[PDB]
Design a protein around this nucleic acid. Structure first.
Ligand code: MG
Ligand code: MG
Ligand code: MG
Ligand code: MG
Ligand code: MG
Ligand code: MG
Ligand code: MG
Ligand code: MG
Ligand code: MG
Ligand code: MG
Ligand code: ZN
Lengths: 166, 110, 46, 295, 153, 51, 144, 87
RNA sequence: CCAGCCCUAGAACAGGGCACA
């Protein structure tokens, strides 16, 4: 197996020089061997990507999925860790920077079919990884406007060269 | 029918990452002005409803302990009073349940 | 800015809902009665 | 005096920042205050805050984002308190939103903030060759359909009144001002420094003197968002983006014995309490009328 | 095509749906407040209103008596229906029940759940959704409009 | 088909394996302080003068 | 310097955890600038246990020291105090030594702080103290 | 409901005018346009009036199917193929 | 504008209504 999301939380940075902007705190947390499915957990992980922690908890409280409670507990433990261990005041000043889900070790069973046939049934397990960064959530990217489209097209036209001409 | 070829990860992602399959965000979430917990604008508050449900379960437990039988239902109205309360002139003649707990702030005397 | 969904009855009070209803009703009645005589205000050439 | 409007705004902001730096340096050390939370939701909560640095907005940030989004005003144990005002001593805080049972204080604060924003729009939506002097913001109740602001224009401007196009341009400027998030900053200063802050508006000087005469310490409250500074009573809302709907309803010229004043009346509704289109039109038609409340 | 259908299919058929609604009505008459699925409670509300009307029809009415005998499975609730529920619903016309959607069931099915309650019961009042006060900004503006309209007449 | 998981980390020590240790625990120090010195409240004012 | 070996040789097993546990994930910048009052031996005690025949001699020494302490965060930001302020501290270090041991090095055992000592310097950040997390069937009780 | 009517240039009326049923007189022929009664996703027998297979003479799970939909040589089905859908 | 609630609209999503009463 591999356990690096946990050790990602033990790196220490050198002290900051007077004048350098304050580095935002990054908190890595994870839950291993969840009975939920990998893709069904990826859906809930994608739901709460880039959102504030309070908004993510508000969405997960009313999500009807089973992994919603697991992700909510993981987010709450990550907030508690960020407040206690790391020097992070304003416990509501965290946003979900990274939120993905990986697979775990499966359990192989037999699924009977009929006429003496069977199938390989896989009891699936998943991991949920989350990363909380101190600060306001980054603004959502807006779709490209017509002015930007026209600018990019004009620049593409201006970048042309006479090919195989020299 | 059997599949003719293996579907690639590209088409698989295009299928199961379409916004039709993504979880939609809910915009009807608000806070409860009483306890501060989260609730939907069209649904009762879970915390307050749990409080009321626990109080109702206790009241029903006591009112069922009062009636030693399964088919013994009162033919008159019922009134629940808490510690330090007395039945009024309008509440007399009804069945009386007495709770040792003090009257909650949300339960109105009426 | 996560703006929430709103309708016309969310922020109204127990006393302003009937007032709003009757106000819109009287406005609609007046507007429908104003157009009852179309041939005397400014009709187009027949 | 030979002073450009941009130079006047620059010097006003410079003296404001100097007074703010003096207020900050008045406290050399970092004292810890213990502020309780007497709200109905989470009682018994205690915040160990910094003296003259931490704010009720910082308390709300410690609590939850829902508090920062909903709570507009704060009640520090005896009186309303805006979110971006640093706390002074150990106290107890109660947060106040728009949908409270007695939201009168928040209504007054929102009315004052809307009046201040409208005055900021009017002061800068006019020609530089003309003189424009804001008198004050008449404290009208919320039952009145509009918030009013008193202006005095150049002498050669007393014959014309703004048309619907001009009112729409004022509304567009106010919406553009709302678009950019500008927090309302407060400052407890003295009349001595407020006089040199303004130094040009005789009406503003008279208002500052009248507000300082009723105070035994001669302390007046200045408010500033972006580059606009104004004197007003009571606290304000934390941000401008709280104002969702905003319209400049009308202007009314009142001619007195000494001079005439243009009362600009406008209407606004928050993001939390935005109304339907027809309701907004009815309220706007009511606000188009005259509002006369001074004492 | 289910145009103009008013009853939803429940249980193992029409008779099973009738029996389910009958059990729910018996429980509602007994406890004055129950909680079930949203669809079953929405189907039961009309039967509860009609049962209160049949109870208001009187004790000596043989039709109402046999209707109560059929519906109320526990036979100790018929005197209750005729001497507690019907007498206390006299000035009212159709406002006998109150149905409110409660959060989804905490079980794995996550069923949409409602709570039905006979008005005027001896139970803690549910957290009913109260409208905003007249002291709100918008409500005060509408009050000013109303006062102007009153003064204009 | 019949397979299970392993490595369920649990910490459970009992008095029997605690006392059946072949060699005692060698301690290079004690637990805490036996006789704590309670200083007089006038140290802040007597530290101002040397003699 | 995070020299756990020499730290174990200097301080004892009761002094090591209390000074390494809450700091193993932080950066320290500690220095020694001045000392107004020389250290003074206050009292000397000895604990003799006859079950093994072992004697531990503890010596309390009062120190008036002038130190500069700056505890940084695991991300590099200042947490506790500045690295240039020479704060004055008064402590009572209790050293201990096993007298039966042939080597018997002098090791710092405990750190007594008087109860009337001035409170420590305030932290740079703010703290929220949560109230009692209430169950639905429980009501808040305001203490006065 | 908001509809558009193609009129001549001499039969134009001012916008905002009311229109009444006496616009039509007893004895006249009219055209009536409306959205018909929607029966949802209906089968081929109710949508196109196709005949089904016999009821019980051996047929297995086909009593309402459309049957053959195209020809073997075309190796595809034509766009004008009658198939179940909205009705 | 679309939270919710009805529908002669609908597999889901969509679509029409929710002031007279
Ligand atoms: Mg077999
Ligand atoms: Mg498989
Ligand atoms: Mg396979
Ligand atoms: Mg249909
Ligand atoms: Mg046939
Ligand atoms: Mg066959
Ligand atoms: Mg068959
Ligand atoms: Mg067969
Ligand atoms: Mg072909
Ligand atoms: Mg619609
Ligand atoms: Zn609640």
């Amino acid at each position: 197996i591999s356990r690096k999301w946990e050790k990602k939380n033990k790196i220490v940075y050198p002290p900051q020089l007077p004048g350098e902007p304050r580095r935002p705190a990054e908190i890595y947390h994870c839950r291993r061997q969840i009975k939920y499915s990998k893709d069904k957990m990826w859906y809930l992980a994608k739901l709460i990507r880039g959102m504030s922690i309070d908004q993510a908890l508000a969405q997960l409280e009313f999500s009807d999925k089973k992994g919603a409670q697991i992700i909510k507990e993981v987010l709450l433990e990550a907030q508690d860790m960020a407040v206690r261990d790391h020097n992070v005041e304003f416990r509501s000043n965290l946003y979900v920077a990274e939120s993905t889900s990986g697979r775990g070790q499966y359990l192989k069973r037999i699924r009977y079919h009929g006429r003496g046939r069977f199938g390989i049934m896989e009891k699936v397990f998943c991991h949920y990884f989350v990363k909380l960064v101190e600060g306001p959530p980054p603004p959502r990217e807006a779709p490209k406007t017509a002015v930007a489209h026209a600018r990019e097209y004009i620049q593409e036209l201006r970048n042309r060269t006479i090919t195989h001409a020299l | 029918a059997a599949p003719k070829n293996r579907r690639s990860i590209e088409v698989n992602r295009c299928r199961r990452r379409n916004p039709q399959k993504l979880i939609k965000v809910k915009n009807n979430i608000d806070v409860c002005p009483e306890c501060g917990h989260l609730k939907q604008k069209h649904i009762l508050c879970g915390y307050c409803y749990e409080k009321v449900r626990k109080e109702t379960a206790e009241i029903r437990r006591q009112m069922g302990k009062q009636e030693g039988g399964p088919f013994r239902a009162p033919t008159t109205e019922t009134v629940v009073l808490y510690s330090g309360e007395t039945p009024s002139e309008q509440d007399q003649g009804k069945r009386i349940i007495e709770r040792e707990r003090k009257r909650p702030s949300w339960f109105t005397q009426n | 800015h996560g703006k929430s969904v709103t309708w016309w009855d969310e922020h109204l009070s127990e006393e302003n809902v009937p007032f709003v209803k009757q106000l819109v009703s009287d406005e609609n009645k007046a507007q429908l009665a104003s157009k009852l005589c179309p041939l005397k205000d400014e009709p187009w050439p027949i | 005096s030979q002073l450009s409007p941009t130079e006047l705004i620059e010097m006003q902001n410079d003296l404001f920042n100097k007074e703010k730096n003096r207020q900050l340096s008045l406290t050399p050390r970092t004292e810890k205050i213990e502020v309780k939370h007497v709200g109905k939701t989470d009682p018994g909560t205690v915040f160990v805050m910094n003296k003259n640095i931490s704010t009720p907005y910082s308390c709300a940030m410690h609590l939850s984002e829902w508090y920062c989004r909903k709570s507009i005003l704060a009640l520090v144990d005896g009186q309303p308190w805006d979110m971006y005002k640093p706390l002074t001593k150990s106290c107890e805080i109660k947060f106040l939103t728009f949908k409270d049972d007695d939201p009168g204080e928040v209504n007054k604060a929102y009315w004052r903030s809307c009046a201040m924003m409208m005055g900021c729009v009017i002061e800068r939506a006019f020609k530089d060759e003309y003189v424009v002097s804001l008198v004050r913001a008449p404290e009208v109740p919320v039952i009145a359909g509009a918030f009013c602001y008193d202006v005095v224009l150049d002498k050669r401007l007393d014959e014309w009144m703004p048309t619907k196009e001009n009112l729409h341009s004022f509304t567009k400027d106010a919406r553009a001002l709302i678009y950019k998030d500008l927090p309302f900053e407060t400052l407890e200063v003295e009349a001595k420094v407020a006089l040199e802050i303004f130094q040009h508006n005789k009406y503003k000087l008279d208002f500052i003197e009248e507000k300082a005469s009723q105070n035994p310490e001669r302390i007046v409250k200045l408010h500033r968002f972006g580059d606009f500074i104004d004197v007003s009573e009571g606290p304000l809302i934390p941000r401008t983006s709280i104002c969702f709907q905003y319209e400049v309803s009308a202007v009314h010229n009142l001619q007195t014995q000494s001079s005439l004043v243009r009362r600009f009346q406008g209407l606004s509704l928050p993001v939390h309490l935005r109304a339907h289109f027809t309701i907004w039109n009815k309220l706007l038609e009511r606000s188009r009328k005259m509002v006369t409340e001074d004492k | 095509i289910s145009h103009g259908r008013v009853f939803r299919r429940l249980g193992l058929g029409p008779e099973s749906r009738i029996h389910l609604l009958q059990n729910l009505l018996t429980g509602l008459v007994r406890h004055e407040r129950i909680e079930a699925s949203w669809a079953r409670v929405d189907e039961l509300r009309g039967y509860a209103e009609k049962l209160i009307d049949y109870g208001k029809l009187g004790d000596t009415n043989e039709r109402a008596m046999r209707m109560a005998d059929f519906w109320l499975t526990e036979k100790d609730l018929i005197p209750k229906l005729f001497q507690v529920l019907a007498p206390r619903f006299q000035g009212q016309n159709g406002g006998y029940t109150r149905m409110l959607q409660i959060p989804n069931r905490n079980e794995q099915d996550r069923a949409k759940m409602a709570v039905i309650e006979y008005k005027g019961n001896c139970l803690p009042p549910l957290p009913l959704p109260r409208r905003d006060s007249n002291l709100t900004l918008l409500n005060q503006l509408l009050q000013g409009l109303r006062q102007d309209q009153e003064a204009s007449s | 088909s019949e397979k299970e998981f392993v490595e369920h980390a649990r910490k459970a020590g009992l008095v029997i394996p605690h006392e059946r240790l072949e060699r005692p625990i060698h301690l290079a120090c004690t637990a805490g302080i036996f006789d704590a010195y309670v200083p007089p409240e006038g140290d802040a004012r007597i530290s101002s003068l040397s003699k | 310097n995070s020299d756990h070996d020499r730290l174990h040789t200097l301080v004892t097993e009761n002094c090591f955890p209390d000074m390494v546990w809450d700091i193993r994930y932080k950066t320290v910048r500690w220095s020694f600038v001045e000392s107004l009052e020389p250290p003074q031996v206050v009292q000397v005690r000895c604990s003799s246990l006859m079950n093994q025949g072992n004697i531990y001699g503890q010596v309390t020494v009062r120190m008036h020291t002038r130190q500069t302490l700056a505890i940084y965060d695991r991300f590099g930001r200042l947490m506790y105090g500045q690295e240039d302020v020479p704060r004055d501290v008064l402590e009572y270090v209790v050293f201990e030594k096993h007298l039966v041991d042939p080597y018997g090095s002098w090791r710092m055992h405990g750190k007594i702080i008087p109860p009337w000592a001035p409170p420590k310097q305030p932290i740079l950040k703010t703290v929220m103290i949560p109230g009692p997390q209430l169950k639905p069937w429980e009501e808040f009780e305001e203490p006065q | 409901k908001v509809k558009i009517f193609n009129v001549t240039e001499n039969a134009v009326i001012k916008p905002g005018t009311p229109l009444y049923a006496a616009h039509f007189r007893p004895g006249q022929y009219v055209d009536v346009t409306a959205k018909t009664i929607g029966k949802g996703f209906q089968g081929v027998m109710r949508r196109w009036g196709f005949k089904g297979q016999p009821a019980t003479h051996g047929q297995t799970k086909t009593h309402r199917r459309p049957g053959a939909i195209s020809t073997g040589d075309v190796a595809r089905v034509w766009p004008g193929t009658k198939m179940p859908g909205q009705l």
